[PDB]
Design an enzyme around this catalytic site. Structure first.
Site, PDB file in Angstrom:
ATOM      1  N   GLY A  67      50.657  37.122  46.878  1.00  0.00           N
ATOM      2  CA  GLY A  67      51.921  37.198  47.588  1.00  0.00           C
ATOM      3  C   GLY A  67      52.301  35.864  48.227  1.00  0.00           C
ATOM      4  O   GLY A  67      53.361  35.312  47.938  1.00  0.00           O
TER       5      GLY A  67
ATOM      6  N   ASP B  57      42.450  31.509  41.138  1.00  0.00           N
ATOM      7  CA  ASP B  57      42.627  32.940  41.305  1.00  0.00           C
ATOM      8  C   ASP B  57      41.893  33.631  40.161  1.00  0.00           C
ATOM      9  O   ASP B  57      41.934  33.156  39.028  1.00  0.00           O
ATOM     10  CB  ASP B  57      44.104  33.353  41.360  1.00  0.00           C
ATOM     11  CG  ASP B  57      44.315  34.707  42.033  1.00  0.00           C
ATOM     12  OD1 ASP B  57      43.602  35.659  41.641  1.00  0.00           O
ATOM     13  OD2 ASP B  57      45.184  34.807  42.959  1.00  0.00           O
TER      14      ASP B  57
ATOM     15  N   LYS C 286      46.950  35.622  36.917  1.00  0.00           N
ATOM     16  CA  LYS C 286      47.873  35.098  37.904  1.00  0.00           C
ATOM     17  C   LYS C 286      48.082  33.606  37.673  1.00  0.00           C
ATOM     18  O   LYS C 286      49.239  33.174  37.633  1.00  0.00           O
ATOM     19  CB  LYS C 286      47.439  35.473  39.321  1.00  0.00           C
ATOM     20  CG  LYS C 286      47.819  36.900  39.686  1.00  0.00           C
ATOM     21  CD  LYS C 286      47.310  37.369  41.022  1.00  0.00           C
ATOM     22  CE  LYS C 286      47.710  38.801  41.302  1.00  0.00           C
ATOM     23  NZ  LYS C 286      47.023  39.326  42.503  1.00  0.00           N
TER      24      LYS C 286
ATOM     25  N   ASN D  23      40.740  37.803  51.941  1.00  0.00           N
ATOM     26  CA  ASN D  23      39.473  38.381  52.338  1.00  0.00           C
ATOM     27  C   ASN D  23      38.665  37.300  53.048  1.00  0.00           C
ATOM     28  O   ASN D  23      38.863  36.109  52.793  1.00  0.00           O
ATOM     29  CB  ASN D  23      38.727  38.974  51.144  1.00  0.00           C
ATOM     30  CG  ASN D  23      38.311  37.899  50.154  1.00  0.00           C
ATOM     31  OD1 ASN D  23      39.132  37.372  49.400  1.00  0.00           O
ATOM     32  ND2 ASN D  23      37.040  37.541  50.164  1.00  0.00           N
TER      33      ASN D  23
ATOM     34  N   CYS E 232      37.585  24.703  62.930  1.00  0.00           N
ATOM     35  CA  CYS E 232      37.422  25.200  61.576  1.00  0.00           C
ATOM     36  C   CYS E 232      37.517  26.725  61.624  1.00  0.00           C
ATOM     37  O   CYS E 232      37.685  27.295  62.690  1.00  0.00           O
ATOM     38  CB  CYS E 232      36.117  24.724  60.941  1.00  0.00           C
ATOM     39  SG  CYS E 232      34.737  25.862  61.221  1.00  0.00           S
TER      40      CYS E 232
ATOM     41  N   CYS F 256      34.874  28.407  63.873  1.00  0.00           N
ATOM     42  CA  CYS F 256      34.991  28.053  65.274  1.00  0.00           C
ATOM     43  C   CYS F 256      35.366  29.255  66.149  1.00  0.00           C
ATOM     44  O   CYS F 256      34.889  29.324  67.279  1.00  0.00           O
ATOM     45  CB  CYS F 256      36.041  26.963  65.435  1.00  0.00           C
ATOM     46  SG  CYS F 256      35.442  25.299  65.076  1.00  0.00           S
TER      47      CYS F 256
ATOM     48  N   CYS G  75      45.167  51.716  50.586  1.00  0.00           N
ATOM     49  CA  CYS G  75      45.210  50.330  50.142  1.00  0.00           C
ATOM     50  C   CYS G  75      46.112  49.562  51.107  1.00  0.00           C
ATOM     51  O   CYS G  75      46.944  50.172  51.784  1.00  0.00           O
ATOM     52  CB  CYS G  75      45.759  50.220  48.724  1.00  0.00           C
ATOM     53  SG  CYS G  75      47.533  50.594  48.614  1.00  0.00           S
TER      54      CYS G  75
HETATM   55  N1  LIG Z   1      37.198  34.433  45.848  1.00  0.00           N
HETATM   56  C1  LIG Z   1      38.454  34.325  45.353  1.00  0.00           C
HETATM   57  N2  LIG Z   1      38.760  33.398  44.415  1.00  0.00           N
HETATM   58  C2  LIG Z   1      40.006  33.262  43.909  1.00  0.00           C
HETATM   59  N3  LIG Z   1      41.054  34.028  44.245  1.00  0.00           N
HETATM   60  C3  LIG Z   1      40.886  34.994  45.182  1.00  0.00           C
HETATM   61  C4  LIG Z   1      39.558  35.200  45.798  1.00  0.00           C
HETATM   62  N4  LIG Z   1      39.684  36.220  46.630  1.00  0.00           N
HETATM   63  C5  LIG Z   1      40.978  36.618  46.582  1.00  0.00           C
HETATM   64  N5  LIG Z   1      41.699  35.883  45.725  1.00  0.00           N
HETATM   65  C6  LIG Z   1      43.120  36.026  45.352  1.00  0.00           C
HETATM   66  O1  LIG Z   1      44.046  35.866  46.404  1.00  0.00           O
HETATM   67  C7  LIG Z   1      45.255  36.533  46.021  1.00  0.00           C
HETATM   68  C8  LIG Z   1      46.105  36.988  47.219  1.00  0.00           C
HETATM   69  O2  LIG Z   1      46.118  38.397  47.369  1.00  0.00           O
HETATM   70  P1  LIG Z   1      47.376  39.407  47.314  1.00  0.00           P
HETATM   71  O3  LIG Z   1      46.940  40.441  48.318  1.00  0.00           O
HETATM   72  O4  LIG Z   1      48.659  38.679  47.536  1.00  0.00           O
HETATM   73  O5  LIG Z   1      47.298  40.084  45.822  1.00  0.00           O
HETATM   74  P2  LIG Z   1      46.318  41.325  45.373  1.00  0.00           P
HETATM   75  O6  LIG Z   1      44.999  41.195  46.095  1.00  0.00           O
HETATM   76  O7  LIG Z   1      46.245  41.589  43.877  1.00  0.00           O
HETATM   77  O8  LIG Z   1      47.175  42.544  45.987  1.00  0.00           O
HETATM   78  P3  LIG Z   1      46.662  43.982  46.550  1.00  0.00           P
HETATM   79  O9  LIG Z   1      45.697  43.592  47.644  1.00  0.00           O
HETATM   80  O10 LIG Z   1      47.981  44.631  46.952  1.00  0.00           O
HETATM   81  O11 LIG Z   1      45.931  44.739  45.465  1.00  0.00           O
HETATM   82  C9  LIG Z   1      44.842  37.618  45.027  1.00  0.00           C
HETATM   83  O12 LIG Z   1      45.520  37.316  43.815  1.00  0.00           O
HETATM   84  C10 LIG Z   1      43.344  37.445  44.885  1.00  0.00           C
HETATM   85  O13 LIG Z   1      42.816  37.604  43.567  1.00  0.00           O
HETATM   86 MG   LIG Z   2      45.171  42.641  42.359  1.00  0.00          MG
HETATM   87 ZN   LIG Z   3      33.880  25.039  63.294  1.00  0.00          ZN
END
Ligand SMILES: Nc1ncnc2c1ncn2[C@@H]1O[C@H](COP(=O)(O)OP(=O)(O)OP(=O)(O)O)[C@@H](O)[C@H]1O
Ligand SMILES: [Mg+2]
Ligand SMILES: [Zn+2]
Ligand SMILES: Nc1ncnc2c1ncn2[C@@H]1O[C@H](COP(=O)(O)OP(=O)(O)OP(=O)(O)O)[C@@H](O)[C@H]1O
Ligand SMILES: [Mg+2]
Ligand SMILES: [Mg+2]
Ligand SMILES: [Mg+2]
Ligand SMILES: [Zn+2]
Lengths: 278, 283
Positions: free
Chosen positions: B48, B69, B92, B149, B191, B194, B211
């Site tokens: 997003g 991604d 993506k 995450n 960071c 921190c 979700c």
């Molecule tokens: N360790 C990682 N390496 C690369 N990309 C990541 C990692 N963890 C998360 N992402 C990416 O960050 C993006 C941002 O998440 P966003 O919530 O916008 O989409 P999504 O996770 O597919 O949606 P939803 O959570 O609604 O299913 C996602 O496409 C996800 O794959």
């Molecule tokens: Mg997804």
């Molecule tokens: Zn720090």
């Protein structure tokens, strides 16, 4: 590829484009989200702000959009979001309809490729505010000014004062680093003629600067206000500014001027005061 | 379609896709706009926030983007901007790259369809941060965390503390109605280790098989302020924010500066803070 959906589903599947929106219900943020399907919003100006506003509403599952613009997509527009270079040469409303229909086939569209300030077009424009609602003959629920000039803003103003039509006005500085949204309920809040413009920053052969950032923030807050207004969650702003240089977001509430130049604004204020003492 | 432009131009013509950007120059907002072409930015998470962020930088005329991604586009993503339903099933980074190349042929891309967190992928990821700059062998100017995450965020943190890499962290809540951006200059600003995120967001986070919810509006705002911050940082105009939050229910946008924690979990953050204090002591 997406097929037409008859009733919005809460179902948490990869195939449901509404799953992450209907999620707002289970989380108690927006308790009757599917209501978004019952509203119609008109957008005048499908440029920098207008187009992203339209995208956002479409992805949200607005029932109907009405787009008004007289301009064609050009390469000079590619600094802003939404329009892509292959759309250069098409009319903005047409490019917009084409893409948006692709994005969400559940949304109804009505587009008009004219200037709203000429005499003939204005009568039509008003007719479409009054009758261009989701059900034909009923008015639109909200008008969105995303035009770039005084004349057009004033025109929407005149129309909405006469119809008693709630609208939101959005603007972006010619220097690209400030903008605002403003809520106009004629009679209850200051109309556009009621006062000089609210600024949020200080201060013939060339053009205004624009950034995709500012346009995205403004469209963002604009549509957020729309959702809050139509779906009755959070607090609606009557004015929210954005100063990009300072990272500053002033709010305000503009009260009506009782000697407003616009006779209809005066009349609407009168009507409001009457309704108030019940 | 759009033709490659070798040298950006102020010329105000309908065929110039840079005219309205270079207008910033003759209006004394940005004196050296064309310098945007000389920067590389890496974007982890092209969801997003990321996708819109990428689009924003692309249209601005960024020199080079590195997209990381591990996920495919899904119809469930169609509530957020950029990706269109016909792109469902594509990675993506693949979908993004294709579309972005269309939008601005002048921008260089390096795309990576993997999970930043796995041992071998992490090494590669650090290599690309150090060497994936506009010129090979030189580092990127900025990393942008647009992941969703803790694990990924913490990985980037670890990477950037070791490399001394300035980055911006962005996030949106699971409930869709709040988000923030944070500028991390290892040793100069806090960071990611921190301070606790729950604490950091205590004044913006609304509190509720669910979700996560998401909104096009909130992602649009967050990506907007994020890229606005990138532009102010690289092009040296306006005031850079070290933290800027957004509460959508109440239209509240708190800023704070955050100083580094001297007892940080990250030994490198701590080492960087020493390095910084020495550099100020001998200025
Ligand atoms: N360790 C990682 N390496 C690369 N990309 C990541 C990692 N963890 C998360 N992402 C990416 O960050 C993006 C941002 O998440 P966003 O919530 O916008 O989409 P999504 O996770 O597919 O949606 P939803 O959570 O609604 O299913 C996602 O496409 C996800 O794959
Ligand atoms: Mg997804
Ligand atoms: Zn720090
Ligand atoms: N009277 C009017 N009727 C309909 N649309 C209008 C009117 N006046 C302005 N607009 C539209 O509002 C839109 C928003 O303007 P924006 O500044 O984003 O685009 P633009 O005018 O092409 O950009 P630039 O000013 O850089 O060329 C424009 O598409 C413009 O056509
Ligand atoms: Mg134009
Ligand atoms: Mg304009
Ligand atoms: Mg996610
Ligand atoms: Zn008035």
């Amino acid at each position: 590829g997406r097929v037409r959906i008859e009733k919005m589903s809460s179902e948490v599947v990869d195939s449901n484009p509404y799953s992450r929106l209907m999620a707002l219900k289970r989380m108690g943020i927006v308790s009757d989200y599917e209501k978004i399907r019952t509203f119609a919003v008109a957008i005048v100006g499908v440029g920098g702000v207008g187009s992203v506003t339209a995208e956002m509403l479409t992805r949200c599952g607005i029932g109907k959009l009405l787009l008004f613009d007289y301009d064609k997509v050009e390469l000079a527009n590619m600094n802003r979001l939404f329009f892509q270079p292959h759309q250069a040469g098409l009319s903005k409303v047409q490019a917009a309809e084409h893409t948006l229909r692709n994005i969400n086939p559940d949304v109804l569209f009505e587009v008009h490729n004219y200037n709203i300030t000429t005499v003939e077009n204005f009568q039509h424009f008003m007719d479409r505010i009054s009758n261009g609602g989701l059900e034909e003959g009923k008015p639109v629920d909200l008008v969105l000014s995303c035009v770039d000039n005084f004349e057009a803003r004033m025109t929407i103003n005149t129309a909405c004062n006469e119809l008693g039509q709630t609208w939101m006005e959005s603007g972006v500085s010619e220097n690209a680093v400030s903008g605002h949204i403003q809520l106009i309920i004629p009679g209850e809040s200051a109309c556009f003629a009621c006062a000089p413009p609210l600024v949020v920053a200080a201060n013939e052969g060339v053009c205004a600067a624009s950034l995709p950032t500012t346009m995205g923030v403004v469209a963002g807050i604009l549509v957020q206000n729309v959702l809050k207004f139509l779906l009755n969650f959070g607090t609606v702003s009557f004015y929210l500014g954005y100063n990009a240089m300072q990272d500053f977001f002033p709010t305000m509430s503009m009260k009506p001027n009782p000697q407003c130049d616009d006779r209809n604004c005066r009349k609407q204020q009168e009507e409001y005061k009457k309704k108030v003492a019940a």
